[model samples]
Target: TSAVQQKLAALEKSSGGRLGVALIDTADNTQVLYRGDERFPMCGTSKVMAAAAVLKQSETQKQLLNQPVEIKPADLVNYNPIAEKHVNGTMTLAELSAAALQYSDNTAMNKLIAQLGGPGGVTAFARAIGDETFRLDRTESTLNTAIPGDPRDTTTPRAMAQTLRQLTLGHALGETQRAQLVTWLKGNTTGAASIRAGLPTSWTVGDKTGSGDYGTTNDIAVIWPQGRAPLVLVTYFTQPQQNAESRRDVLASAARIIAEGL
Candidate 1:
């Protein structure tokens, strides 16, 4: 694992010991790079796994992506401009899903989860995805709002990395279902930094980034080779100050070096 070990040492040197990196090259069954692969607060990157579980269930139940669901005012607690406008109206599961990943819209993702069931829906979905160490917490609304009396959310670097690799290889979901999930992921509003900080300008990534003022940060991305196989990168950081500028540089630099060498 010379490729990954070198990258991890570089990241550790650059971040002053505040970062963790995980990489998997499913193309050849390799653990490209990993540090602190166990528990790390995943923040919004949990939404990607949550979304996948939903699709796997729907496919099992023979449901269509265009299935319509109602949006209610109560579900609007997160107050997203785009999601709010869709409130009390009709939208397909497809449209709500787009908002969930493309903008990381908590309200929209929660609404879809509610339609699927609730926090119970998300938890059951994660368990269904063959994940034991990962569970969705009480992050039922957008930004910092919890679901009334709900507790906080949590996840691990290993679980996110595994889930992404499964999705990439279309394990639980069929190729079509996996493609659909990645299509929405491409709309991720999370920036190029964090787990996605580095890459050739022309490379394409299906990625999601998560940040919390509560000092929780995470990034997950899949690099596609036009028509060749793919590579996966996921990193989580828990820093005291929640500094955006410094964190972005650390994540971007580490991810770039890892992805480039792979």
Candidate 2:
């Protein structure tokens, strides 16, 4: 364990960035933390939080997942596949959420955020789930227009990991909604090259991967190891090399180290 700590420290120093990690063993509630209280730009990883809030809102408001949301031309953004491939139209909430989670669709996520009543709603939800520092202060459309020290969306490793733990333990959502979120995560093909690449074939992994400016790359997951209790891992690499492959490889290495020990 000490060697792993040294390895991660070295990795962070070599990349000229900080790394935040939180790993929890669900069986016995054992845990590990590495700069877990430090905040980092969340990027698309915030979608998971948004989805959870929406599900809870549905429960209270009796909002059906089949309800349609209109997407106009102004709602489109430049980054995501949804904005690039689809035109202005209507999509059910479920479809929008799938696009956001599975493909990291920026436009769909922005729309969802709007539905949640801007950034305040997300921060409120975060507080409800025991987070004090996870803040969503801007829409995805303005994600790139941030200053040096602050980002539009941010969270600590511990905060994100705790959120996932809540979802896993049935505190954040109903049984069916939890299953839906897990299904969407497992179906996420965009993150295959990161933490998923480090795990064994027999292991089951559900995760959300996020990338942002200055070489930020992050992945948060619930990993089910063969014959062992499930573990949740939240990892973030801040401002690494310009090469995304290098950042992803670093994530895979970190994930590999954690996975092997479990």
Candidate 3:
């Protein structure tokens, strides 16, 4: 673990950013941590939580995913490519979860939170899963503020890694629901440049990406090394104005370090 830690520390030293990383191997449950408990803005990565919450609630309500949700023009938020362009406009909850998780569509997630009964709906879901470090105080865009000293919308690297493990590998989501979420994440249109960039081409990854003000960027993923059991990994990087660089690559660079050390 210290080998991985030293490599990550070297990466942060050279990259000049506040980097946090955590990994849990599903095979033996081995763990690695580097600033893993520290708070970092969740940014748009909260979409995954919202999507998972919706699925969690669906467990009790058989027809929940089939329910239709309509979107007025005003309901659209920035970065909502899928929802904003849906001509039919009305979509099932299942489709909304796809849009939010695969594309990080802001409008889709806002509707999900609304359906879940507000931000606490997702927060409560996190708590129930034993992840008290994850928080959602606001909706899309607003939740992405990433203000320097603020902690309103933040989660520790370790918490996110654990949540990813629960949904993708553990029993938090039913078998069918877990497969559905895994497909969406594998089809994610936005995370190739994040942690995925550092993995071997033969390795498989399902990731969700995020970016916010102050150069905060994050990638929480379920990764499969060539022939090994899957691993849940999180790379969360933040920079104050004076310490800024391209956040995605910084995260990727950290991933590269972890990939090499692992």
Candidate 4:
């Protein structure tokens, strides 16, 4: 365990950035944290919580899944190709959730956040599910500012992984609700270079990735290792403005470090 911490310490120094990690092995529910309480820009990684909020609401409001939501051309933001193709103009709530979680569509996230009662609603949902350290104060793009040492729109590693484990493992959502979330996550197209890259081909992973200014890149994942209970991982990496370009290799290397130790 100390060996893992030492390696991560060296990796963080060599990365030219700050690194935060929270790992939970369901088999034993043991944890390993590196700066787990320190705040880091959430970036688009908050989409997972946004989607979970909608899904949990659907459990009570049965009509939510089929409800039509408008996605005007003007409302479509960058990184929203999926939402842009809607010539029909409106998408079901469920489809929008898919876009937010699976593709990190910025407009889709903004719309869903509005429908769910804004950023405060997401924070409430996280708290309702037992995460006290999570926060979502702004919308997409702007929230991705990722300023050095700025606390706006940030979350700690422990809250990230703890919330994700609960949501992904059916502790928070019902079977039908959690299934859809996991389905979208497993099909996520945006994180091939993050945590997933560091794992073996034999393992299956569902991940959501976020990018921002100052080299901020993040990945939160539920890893299914063969013959063992799933492992939940949350990793946040960022560098100062002088090193503003986010690096996928850095994220991948962190995953590799964790994998080797495991």
Candidate 5:
């Protein structure tokens, strides 16, 4: 096995739960596929898919990016950082998209899903991008409402890598829309402790992170190492009762190992 593969295997064995991971080197067109085809509950990582779907629909249908959407009182639910801070008000779809991507805000996510014509809207976008395994059926409420064996949203590691590649290649959205998506990902503060924690000081990363009940934590990113072509790393972990810090550390260790190889 390559050094990167060996380290990833070791990390998976020691991780104490199911770990779905994929690492891709864009320059060499090589990949380290460790459980890359396994499906895991996406949690908030699904938000990025929703964002991409929204952008694609807006561009293709000529929907207004600045169209206003109301944040009603009923929209405010638990576990929302952005909506909790602001009460009922009107924010443009663009602003809500930013909040959803940058903060993984539950309220923002739900609003976007609703605006996009529900979960089916996101699913159609995923299908159009050649991702057959990913699903976005339930709203953010599913983050905590999963029944054992039934996750609201699920995707394989390979599918996520493909999705990222689609976005990076400018096939998912128009040029300007693509730039906007990357901007939100780059500005994401919610994932600071997950994927970004494992990267080097000199590296730049744009990622979408997800976490929820039953110790589920996931991070998918396009990582750019200094003076090298960017790579994609998608890591997901689910260990009953595992703390957030531990999950982030496991993913970070894997990311560091992959970075060294590149």
Candidate 6:
């Protein structure tokens, strides 16, 4: 209850707006520290699911992490939102995953998805991981643009927590598989100014943010405190008409409060 109050008060005080926050302690999921309504578009955060699918494939296939993959016009992703903005590469399976998770490189991600079996592979893997409701219904392409689409990449705060919890405990992945996943997370390049902005100098946070101007700002992850159980934090702000600073602060403020209170 105190943890919930901390989040509510922090959101109210910092930006004076309603926030959807959810948390799950390492020991259990039944004790939801906080919660909000049904799932909403989680922006790029849902890519974490896509990443997991690739990792699982890499493991079963025994694909060398350093193996390089080529990109061709014939293999171009069908509906990439940012297809025209970048160049291609012969990237290793590991580098491709890092580019997607760390850099949030959409083009690189789509190419990797194509290599990992495309949208069908990603969606199938999501269902296999028990996140059946969390899916990428879009045609294996860009999502953060103004173009009309299904807005299919969705997840609830609770669902995000469940996914992250599984990742943290390696329930969804074997030990080697889990190690590979965390390796990519440790280098996440996006959401730096948001979730990574408020932590103490020595504290480490394994987190990610999903941003899109047209509809949502999504952030989700657990803080791996020095010697304590990681605190699960999930937030999704929908259809925000607010400016970028306002939305960014809303996420940072909530993260800071949770970091301090939990």
RMSD of each: 3.7, 2.2, 1.7, 1.3, 2.0, 4.0
Comparing 5 and 6 on TM-score, the stronger one: 5
Encode model 2's per-residue lDDT on 107-191: one tens digit a residue: 8888778778987888888899787878898888565332336845888898889888787655678777888888888888788
Query: Against the unseen true structure, what C-alpha lDDT does each candidate score?
Result: 0.68, 0.79, 0.86, 0.88, 0.80, 0.64
Candidate number achieving the greatest TM-score relative to the actual structure: 4
Q: Which regions of candidate 3 fall more than 4 Å away from where they truly are?
A: 242-245
Residue 223's lDDT within candidate 5 is 83
Q: How many pairs collide in each candidate, listed in order?
A: 2, 0, 0, 0, 0, 4
* Tens digits of per-residue lDDT for model 4, 162-258: 9999999856997888988889899999899899999997999999999988889999999999998999999999997745887888778878888
Q: List the residue pairs that clash in candidate 6.
A: 80-141, 80-142, 81-142, 102-189
Instruction: Point out the higher-scoring one by TM-score: 4 or 5.
Output: 4
> What's the TM-score of every candidate structure?
0.83, 0.92, 0.95, 0.96, 0.93, 0.81
TM-score of 3: 0.95
Model 4 lDDT, residue 162, Cα: 91
The full ranking of all candidates by TM-score, starting with the best, is 4, 3, 5, 2, 1, 6
Candidate 3 per-residue lDDT over residues 1-262, each given as its tens digit: 5887988888888876788999898888988899999999988789888998888888888789999999888887777888887745798899999888888888999999999899999999899889889999998878987887687999999889988899888888888778878988888888888998888888889999988777888889889887789888899888878335556887777778778867
In candidate 2, position 141 carries an lDDT of 57
Report the lDDT of model 6 for residue 38: 62
Q: Candidate 6: where are CA atoms >4 Å away? A: 1-18, 27-35, 72-88, 139-142, 145-151, 242-246
Best by lDDT: 4
The sequence of per-residue lDDT tens digits that candidate 5 reaches over residues 12-116 is: 788776777888788888888778887788888888888888888778667667888887788886667777666667877788788888888888989889877
Candidate 6 weakest lDDT stretch, 10 residues:
78-87
Candidate 3: deviation at residue 224, Å? 1.3
Ranked by lDDT, top first: 4, 3, 5, 2, 1, 6
Q: In candidate 1, what are the lDDT values of residues 22-79, reduced to their tens digit?
A: 7777678676546544456566777776677667766766675678777778766643
